[PDB]
Amino acid sequence: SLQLLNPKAESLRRDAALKVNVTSAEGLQSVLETNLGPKGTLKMLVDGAGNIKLTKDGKVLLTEMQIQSPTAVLIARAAAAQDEITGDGTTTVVCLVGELLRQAHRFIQEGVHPRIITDGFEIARKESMKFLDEFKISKTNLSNDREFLLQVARSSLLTKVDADLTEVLTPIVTDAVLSVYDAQADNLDLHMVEIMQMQHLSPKDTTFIKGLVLDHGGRHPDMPTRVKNAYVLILNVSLEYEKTEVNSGFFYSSADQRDKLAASERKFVDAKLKKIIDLKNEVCGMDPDKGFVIINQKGIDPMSLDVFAKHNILALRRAKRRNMERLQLVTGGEAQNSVEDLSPQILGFSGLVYQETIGEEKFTYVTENTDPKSCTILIKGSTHYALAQTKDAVRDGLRAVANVLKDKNIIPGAGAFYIALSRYLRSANMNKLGAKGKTKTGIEAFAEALLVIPKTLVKNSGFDPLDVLAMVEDELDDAQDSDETRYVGVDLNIGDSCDPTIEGIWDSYRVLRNAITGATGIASNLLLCDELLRAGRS
Amino acid sequence: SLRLPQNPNAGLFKQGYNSYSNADGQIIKSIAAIRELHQMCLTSMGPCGRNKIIVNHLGKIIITNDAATMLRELDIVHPAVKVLVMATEQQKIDMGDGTNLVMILAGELLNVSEKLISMGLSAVEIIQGYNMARKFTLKELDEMVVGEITDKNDKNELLKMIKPVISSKKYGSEDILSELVSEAVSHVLPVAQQAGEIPYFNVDSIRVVKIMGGSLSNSTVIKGMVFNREPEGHVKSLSEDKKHKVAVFTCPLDIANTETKGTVLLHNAQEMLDFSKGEEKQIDAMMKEIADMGVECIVAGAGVGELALHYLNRYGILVLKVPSKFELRRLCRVCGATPLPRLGAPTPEELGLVETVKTMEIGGDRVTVFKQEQGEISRTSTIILRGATQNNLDDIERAIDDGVAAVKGLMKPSGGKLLPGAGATEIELISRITKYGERTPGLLQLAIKQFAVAFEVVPRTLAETAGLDVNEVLPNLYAAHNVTEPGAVKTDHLYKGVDIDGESDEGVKDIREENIYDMLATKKFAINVATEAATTVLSIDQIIMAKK
Amino acid sequence: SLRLPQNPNAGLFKQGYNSYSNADGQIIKSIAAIRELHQMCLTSMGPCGRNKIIVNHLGKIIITNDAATMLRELDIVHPAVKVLVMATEQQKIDMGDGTNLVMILAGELLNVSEKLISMGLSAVEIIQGYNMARKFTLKELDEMVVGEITDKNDKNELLKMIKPVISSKKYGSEDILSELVSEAVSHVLPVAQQAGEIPYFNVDSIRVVKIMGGSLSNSTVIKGMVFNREPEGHVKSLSEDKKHKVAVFTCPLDIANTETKGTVLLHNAQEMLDFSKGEEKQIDAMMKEIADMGVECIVAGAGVGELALHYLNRYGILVLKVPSKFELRRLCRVCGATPLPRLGAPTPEELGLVETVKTMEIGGDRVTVFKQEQGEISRTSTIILRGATQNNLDDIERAIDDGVAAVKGLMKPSGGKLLPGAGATEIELISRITKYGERTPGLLQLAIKQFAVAFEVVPRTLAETAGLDVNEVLPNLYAAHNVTDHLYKGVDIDGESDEGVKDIREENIYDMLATKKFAINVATEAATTVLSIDQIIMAKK
Numbered sequence A: 001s002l003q004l005l006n007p008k009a010e011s012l013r014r015d016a017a018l019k020v021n022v023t024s025a026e027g028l029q030s031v032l033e034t035n036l037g038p039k040g041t042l043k044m045l046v047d048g049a050g051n052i053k054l055t056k057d058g059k060v061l062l063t064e065m066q067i068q069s070p071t072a073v074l075i076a077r078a079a080a081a082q083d084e085i086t087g088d089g090t091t092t093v094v095c096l097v098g099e100l101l102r103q104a105h106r107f108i109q110e111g112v113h114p115r116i117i118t119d120g121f122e123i124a125r126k127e128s129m130k131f132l133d134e135f136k137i138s139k140t141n142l143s144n145d146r147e148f149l150l151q152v153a154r155s156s157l158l159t160k161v162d163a164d165l166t167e168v169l170t171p172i173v174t175d176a177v178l179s180v181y182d183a184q185a186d187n188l189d190l191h192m193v194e195i196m197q198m199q200h201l202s203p204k205d206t207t208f209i210k211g212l213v214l215d216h217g218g219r220h221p222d223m224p225t226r227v228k229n230a231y232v233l234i235l236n237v238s239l240e241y242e243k244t245e246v247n248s249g250f251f252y253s254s255a256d257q258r259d260k261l262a263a264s265e266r267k268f269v270d271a272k273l274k275k276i277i278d279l280k281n282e283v284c285g286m287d288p289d290k291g292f293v294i295i296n297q298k299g300i301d302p303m304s305l306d307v308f309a310k311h312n313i314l315a316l317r318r319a320k321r322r323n324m325e326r327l328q329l330v331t332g333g334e335a336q337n338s339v340e341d342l343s344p345q346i347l348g349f350s351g352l353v354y355q356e357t358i359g360e361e362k363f364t365y366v367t368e369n370t371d372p373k374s375c376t377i378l379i380k381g382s383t384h385y386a387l388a389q390t391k392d393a394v395r396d397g398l399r400a401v402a403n404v405l406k407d408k409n410i411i412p413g414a415g416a417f418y419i420a421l422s423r424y425l426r427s428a429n430m431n432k433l434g435a436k437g438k439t440k441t442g443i444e445a446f447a448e449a450l451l452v453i454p455k456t457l458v459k460n461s462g463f464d465p466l467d468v469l470a471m472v473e474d475e476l477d478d479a480q481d482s483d484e485t486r487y488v489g490v491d492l493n494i495g496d497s498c499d500p501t502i503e504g505i506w507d508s509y510r511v512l513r514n515a516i517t518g519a520t521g522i523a524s525n526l527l528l529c530d531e532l533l534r535a536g537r538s
Numbered sequence B: 001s002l003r004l005p006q007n008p009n010a011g012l013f014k015q016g017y018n019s020y021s022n023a024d025g026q027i028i029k030s031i032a033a034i035r036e037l038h039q040m041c042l043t044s045m046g047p048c049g050r051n052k053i054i055v056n057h058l059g060k061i062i063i064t065n066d067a068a069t070m071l072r073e074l075d076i077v078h079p080a081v082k083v084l085v086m087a088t089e090q091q092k093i094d095m096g097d098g099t100n101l102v103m104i105l106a107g108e109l110l111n112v113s114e115k116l117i118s119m120g121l122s123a124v125e126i127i128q129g130y131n132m133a134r135k136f137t138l139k140e141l142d143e144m145v146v147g148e149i150t151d152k153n154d155k156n157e158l159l160k161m162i163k164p165v166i167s168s169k170k171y172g173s174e175d176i177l178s179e180l181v182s183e184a185v186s187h188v189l190p191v192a193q194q195a196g197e198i199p200y201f202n203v204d205s206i207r208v209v210k211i212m213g214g215s216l217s218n219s220t221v222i223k224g225m226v227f228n229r230e231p232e233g234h235v236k237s238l239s240e241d242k243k244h245k246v247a248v249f250t251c252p253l254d255i256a257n258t259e260t261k262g263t264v265l266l267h268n269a270q271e272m273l274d275f276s277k278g279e280e281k282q283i284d285a286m287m288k289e290i291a292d293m294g295v296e297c298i299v300a301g302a303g304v305g306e307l308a309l310h311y312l313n314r315y316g317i318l319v320l321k322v323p324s325k326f327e328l329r330r331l332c333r334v335c336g337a338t339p340l341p342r343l344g345a346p347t348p349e350e351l352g353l354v355e356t357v358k359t360m361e362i363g364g365d366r367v368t369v370f371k372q373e374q375g376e377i378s379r380t381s382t383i384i385l386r387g388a389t390q391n392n393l394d395d396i397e398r399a400i401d402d403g404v405a406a407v408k409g410l411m412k413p414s415g416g417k418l419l420p421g422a423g424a425t426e427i428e429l430i431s432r433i434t435k436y437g438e439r440t441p442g443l444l445q446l447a448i449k450q451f452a453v454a455f456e457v458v459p460r461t462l463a464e465t466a467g468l469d470v471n472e473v474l475p476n477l478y479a480a481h482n483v484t485e486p487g488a489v490k491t492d493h494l495y496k497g498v499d500i501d502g503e504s505d506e507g508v509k510d511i512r513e514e515n516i517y518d519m520l521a522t523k524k525f526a527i528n529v530a531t532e533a534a535t536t537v538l539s540i541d542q543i544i545m546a547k548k
Numbered sequence C: 001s002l003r004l005p006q007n008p009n010a011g012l013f014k015q016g017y018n019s020y021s022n023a024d025g026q027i028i029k030s031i032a033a034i035r036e037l038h039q040m041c042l043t044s045m046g047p048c049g050r051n052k053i054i055v056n057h058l059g060k061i062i063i064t065n066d067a068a069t070m071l072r073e074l075d076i077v078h079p080a081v082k083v084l085v086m087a088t089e090q091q092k093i094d095m096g097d098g099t100n101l102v103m104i105l106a107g108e109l110l111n112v113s114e115k116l117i118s119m120g121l122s123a124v125e126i127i128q129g130y131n132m133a134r135k136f137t138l139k140e141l142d143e144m145v146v147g148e149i150t151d152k153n154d155k156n157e158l159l160k161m162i163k164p165v166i167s168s169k170k171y172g173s174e175d176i177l178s179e180l181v182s183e184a185v186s187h188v189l190p191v192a193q194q195a196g197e198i199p200y201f202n203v204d205s206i207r208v209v210k211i212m213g214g215s216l217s218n219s220t221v222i223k224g225m226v227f228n229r230e231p232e233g234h235v236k237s238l239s240e241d242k243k244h245k246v247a248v249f250t251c252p253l254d255i256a257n258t259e260t261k262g263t264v265l266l267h268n269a270q271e272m273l274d275f276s277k278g279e280e281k282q283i284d285a286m287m288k289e290i291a292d293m294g295v296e297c298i299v300a301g302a303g304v305g306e307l308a309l310h311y312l313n314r315y316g317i318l319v320l321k322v323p324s325k326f327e328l329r330r331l332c333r334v335c336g337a338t339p340l341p342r343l344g345a346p347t348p349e350e351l352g353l354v355e356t357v358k359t360m361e362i363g364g365d366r367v368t369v370f371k372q373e374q375g376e377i378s379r380t381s382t383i384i385l386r387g388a389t390q391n392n393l394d395d396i397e398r399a400i401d402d403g404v405a406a407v408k409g410l411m412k413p414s415g416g417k418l419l420p421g422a423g424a425t426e427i428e429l430i431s432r433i434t435k436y437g438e439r440t441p442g443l444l445q446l447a448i449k450q451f452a453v454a455f456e457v458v459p460r461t462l463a464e465t466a467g468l469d470v471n472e473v474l475p476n477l478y479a480a481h482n483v484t485d486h487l488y489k490g491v492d493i494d495g496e497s498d499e500g501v502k503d504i505r506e507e508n509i510y511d512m513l514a515t516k517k518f519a520i521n522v523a524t525e526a527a528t529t530v531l532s533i534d535q536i537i538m539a540k541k
């Protein structure tokens, strides 16, 4: 039908479209199968430029390696979109769609329709949402348990990096997250927590700074390096020259009038500097002990830097949009734009301001605040890929622990959620459900597909995956009759079951919810498609 | 049968992308890929090390014995080898000392790891083995330390510091090269004894200007600095004592033109007559306030006009060009002047002090000198380095950067904390780490054992490059440490090391009287970054590339 | 999302193999594609049909409005068409009549079955439907016979036989060509009071000698044959001897040489002198015996030597080569002699009789005519065709081959009874099958009805070539069958065809029973194969 219409085209239908979606799914699954879990293998990505970037995140692997298949680009958007808002569960979405297609394809070969199979996944998904309410556990945030946040931070950090980096980088996240909770209980991740690159001694020397760190310092030598008590000032006004909207020549007639008009360039700048001097006169007391610093969002003229250097005022220019939205949280002051209306109330407070330089670059450190509402995480590293590995680790770790404070619940992991849904879907009475007909295998297909995830953790350790679930099955058979509510786990060190409640392995709530919802939608849409084709003008 | 299916489901990725897993002996190949350029580093460590020719696509050649420097120009395909390039680049930037070691140690840790992975040790246990060895290695470096400097400025102490550093890069003669650095270090340091002030030192203070011709013995130590400039108006020997004054201006010595459309406007002939003379009288009037302060040389930051030049050389004011930012900032540190962009009167407190400004022929071209005297000392001194081949000037200049980088190692920590060199610091850790393997149980003992075997490359390399048979020189040196510490105190078997030239057998007559030592701060970060180089290469089990 | 994964069964069968299975749409692709060649045989159908010029790769041009001759030369890449090609060739080699109905009825069953497959009826049931409908068609044709012939000897009785066949191909020539074919069959058949027990007849009895030039009316019948050959030696007497004994030798007239090669050996000059006369006296001993019995004509298949030709010239014996072996035995059937590879001597029992042999030019070229009067002949005849172009005479030969092939189709079986033609029995079968479909309830009733609709093309194809409206004469013809007289209703082809009714007996248009039965069977078997296949596997080039 397509060859007589289009003189050139490609068409697959009714057996190859199903084999393509399953073969491409099994192919992409094998790539990210080994990365899943704590003992998984690392993966570097080097392009033709020659740069190196190292991480285990499936999003970085998918959004850097170009892919030609039409199925995998939907898995790429699904794995990326789930991680872009949640920050965790990337490879879990690929494994579910990677496993649910092959687990249903065996029954498509038997002759079951794709429509009624996907109808079983949807009604089975509603059972999992009802199971999340009973499976989760309530946790009160008023206790302010720091040990509970430490265990959540080690869940994601142990997966990416080893124990040496996890132990030193875990309390860096906990100290940053401990300040997030407040009376308003409004979560703020992007403005409050930041990441900055700095090539320094080693990755292990990452330290926590309570104040806002800046990537610039004092240009002039005579300007002060260290300041004990520095009251900041925010000004978004540009203090260099301005070209003035079509204004043209300073038509000068005589030679004396030439430089007389050139001196007017300083008058516009000096009109704004005098307001700073008038502000300094109000806070002139204890001038050797105290200090003053000005932070500008736009550039400052080098002619005006000597004015600040004479009065021992520290100058910082060309700040980011985000840093201006963070000085009020750290120093406690208020922002200002125009130099007309000033007051001492808007000035912040800082207990220690010092600068340290390496090579050509220079960094400014601010800390020792009275009541800092925000902070930073200055990560140290050796190579560029070391920063990229710490970028993805801190980016995925902050989002995972931040979601625990959003809600009042937390899901235990280590296969407890998948193993619990297996017994629930395989033992629940079907008469309570509304599905009938050939929906018998759809419940078994999706229930059995969840088992492949916790044994993929075992496949990286090298043990037999089927044998380490024998005692797990025998434990739950007696746990229901023993009248003791416990949740089992999968410990890869010894190859035996464990309890995530005491070991500290946990997982966020919206990760597993959005993962199955996004995976079931993608896997269902790929099953119903029975024809592939390419056509268009080019 | 005639053709395979050629890897089905390969259209998931592009045709140019390739995967490289741990299987198929590819981790052995990555160790072999390190072994290609690692053997190039064998003949470049030590005082008998051989330099390397590197011809770039542009044709710029640099001849050198230093790892971090040679690896910058070579375009590398293997990513695991690039870890060593950036690891040595980190070594050069931070400490500026011990880059071959980063290369020769981390390459040998991958060499002995070739035996461990072949035996069947898991990669996770290998990282735990070297980390536990690293904590014990850095601990024992602080224990077996002997000696300290305790004085920032001394003639004899600096010979113990600079001489073992520059002995690797362009050894040559010892005294003529060491005295140029020890004399220049004393000039720039703020001594200030019995004051309690914090010391301070900058790597950018000491800078070497390359001048062709002459010989290495004719090199002198200049108090000030030098450029290859020409005075515009006139040259002056300046035989007048009673020191001159210095005024630095960052703006050009000309009329400050309007930034927005500076154009003449003359409505009548009365303005036409006075406009030509007005510029002359205006420029002259600005020079009166400058000339009355007693200044005789002004350093300009950009192009100077001819009318301003006519009034400067009238009173004999020298003009100097510095058309860049850093070239103008380095000169203010010598005389201690504070520049101001205005064309007004320099402040008397801000005027600099320079006694003489000579112009002589060194390399056939015109150069201007700013030698100070013993009174009113200055900082940011230079070293006139004379040589025949421009390629040798480049490597000797970076040897001063390594020596100046070694002086930085004294400021931050509490003191010097020197160690015995000539392989003595490496061979001592072999016995201590070997004993540590016997104390710990578990399957990690083989990782601790092979970590000690990797440290044999320093004495094995120095014995191979010295033209001696390593099979006889190495076990002869083990006899000094197999006779371990008896009941008598003050044992002197720690200073035994290899020898490049001389007596048979080789245990050197101590590294003592020889006055060669190593820095603690270099060994700390070198073993740290070398272990990180082996950690990142051994921890990864799959590699993915593109386009090749 | 740029390059596909390329169908990962590409490790299986090579790129040259193409699969065109069903569900994908094979049936829709095939039934349609073949509608182009279906219109070729449809336009070339009937007495007013259009002949089609087919130029093969060698360049030999042909112009024939049949179907077997056309499709033999057409290099057709489509495999489903080729089932119809050699199925039509089976009709050519066996019966020699009905190539066109087959290409038309076989294609129309696939065209009319579009409704069955599109509605969703099972393909297996359609094969069972046409098979049971085929059995009812064969049983029902016997009852509609009114032409039970038992004489099959006289010439006027063949006017109901040969003239409908000749009227199809080049309708303008009926009486002339029928006189040639009918007079040829009378010479072929022997004179006897009652010849029975299935007398033998073959297509090689009546041959066709094509002569360039001359109008078709100037043709004539020759009992012998005519060869484009040059006689040698003398001119004939043409009335003097009154009869001529003709010996046919397979081997040439020469000294008997062995298969193994030899040469002349002479030990002395005495044998050299006698060798010149020895060869002359050797043939003279064998040639003089032939002339004693009066053999006035010798035919040697291989090349005749000059020494043997010289002795025959003085006695006045006719010589002839006849190099081809197939046409050598046909001359023996005329005279009534046997081949003789041995030289031997002529015997009276093995030697035949020939009245006279005369030489002239018919179309400018000198030829040898073996016409004889008052002689006994057995299974031999020829038709001398005169025409303006060689391209037209080629179609007259195949028309005569189809005419005499019908004589083979009559006399070989026990009965070759007639049927009403001109769109008379085809519309009757539509009424019979329409009533048969209601007798058997079931899902196969739809196949029985659509099998009857496929027979509609036979009347309207005569109307389409006649420039008449199909929607007027075809439904008007059904009203004539309402009710013997209703059986002899047919399609008229004339300017007065507005009524659409013409009696069959006025012009005596008839068709054969065995020809239509074999055509319906091969047509149903052709449609059975095309509807039974689902997958078609090609290959490279």
Ligand SMILES: Nc1ncnc2c1ncn2[C@@H]1O[C@H](COP(=O)(O)OP(=O)(O)O)[C@@H](O)[C@H]1O
Residues within 6 Å of the ligand: A036, A037, A038, A088, A089, A090, A091, A092, A093, A155, A156, A158, A159, A413, A414, A415, A490, A491, A492, A505, A506, A507
């Ligand atoms: N140390 C551990 N012990 C047991 N299970 C773990 C451990 N670390 C991670 N997991 C499990 O691995 C799964 C994936 O973790 P994570 O890397 O955060 O998500 P993703 O692999 O989708 O990016 C989680 O379900 C978690 O329970």
Ligand SMILES: Nc1ncnc2c1ncn2[C@@H]1O[C@H](COP(=O)(O)OP(=O)(O)O)[C@@H](O)[C@H]1O
Residues within 6 Å of the ligand: B045, B046, B047, B097, B098, B099, B100, B101, B164, B165, B166, B167, B168, B169, B402, B420, B421, B422, B423, B498, B499, B500, B516, B517, B518
């Ligand atoms: N003359 C000498 N005798 C004995 N040992 C020496 C001598 N010169 C250098 N060495 C040893 O050779 C080693 C070479 O160190 P190397 O890595 O080349 O230093 P650098 O970092 O300056 O390149 C030193 O650690 C030192 O102990």
Ligand SMILES: Nc1ncnc2c1ncn2[C@@H]1O[C@H](COP(=O)(O)OP(=O)(O)O)[C@@H](O)[C@H]1O
Residues within 6 Å of the ligand: C045, C046, C047, C097, C098, C099, C100, C101, C102, C164, C167, C168, C169, C421, C422, C423, C490, C491, C492, C493, C507, C509, C510, C511, C515
């Ligand atoms: N003068 C005529 N009047 C009516 N019908 C005619 C006339 N001449 C020929 N026909 C019809 O034209 C048809 C041509 O059939 P044809 O395809 O030649 O038969 P076959 O397929 O057996 O070779 C015949 O069935 C015959 O009935």
Ligand SMILES: [Mg+2]
Residues within 6 Å of the ligand: A088, A089, A156, A159, A396
């Ligand atoms: Mg994760």
Ligand SMILES: [Mg+2]
Residues within 6 Å of the ligand: B097, B098, B164, B165, B166, B168
């Ligand atoms: Mg050194």
Ligand SMILES: [Mg+2]
Residues within 6 Å of the ligand: C097, C098, C165, C168, C402
């Ligand atoms: Mg016919």
